[PDB]
């Protein structure tokens, strides 16, 4: 099935701007039907910083109905955007093309002012 082979940790999930999430799953030590999520995210969102290099991602995945939540802190060897994003959503394997539908929040500073911006990303399996 499609919800299997997601679990292989072999695939790319590409959003509407060409940003890429590469997920890796490991069984949760304590939670039934749950996986720890690792992997990398390559940003391509228009007008944003920290594009084009891998950032580690972390979170958790519920295999019972294929729901996921994962986050990235925008700090690596290439660029630091002093920010973090969290995506939460679900895999839809019903169509011939699998889609991960997410809502996200981006926390960041503008001067000394903190803010949290909202958006939506849909990722298609390549």
């Amino acid at each position: 099935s499609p919800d299997m082979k997601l679990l292989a940790g072999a695939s790319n999930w590409v959003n509407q701007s060409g940003s890429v999430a590469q997920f890796v799953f490991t069984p949760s030590p304590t939670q039934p039907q749950t996986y720890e999520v690792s992997g990398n995210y390559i940003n391509n969102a228009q007008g944003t910083g920290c594009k084009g290099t891998p950032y580690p991602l972390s979170g958790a995945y519920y295999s019972g109905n294929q729901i996921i939540s994962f986050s990235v802190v925008w700090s690596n060897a290439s660029a630091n955007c002093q920010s973090a994003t969290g995506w939460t959503g679900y895999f839809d394997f019903s169509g011939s093309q699998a889609v991960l539908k997410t809502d996200w929040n981006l926390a960041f500073y503008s001067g000394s002012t903190p803010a949290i911006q909202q958006g939506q990303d849909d990722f298609m399996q390549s």
Binding site: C50, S75, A77, A79, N80, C81, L106, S110, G111
Partner: peptide
Amino acid sequence: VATVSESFLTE
């Protein structure tokens, strides 16, 4: 070393 940007939205 990494480049530093004020935010993910603004250099």
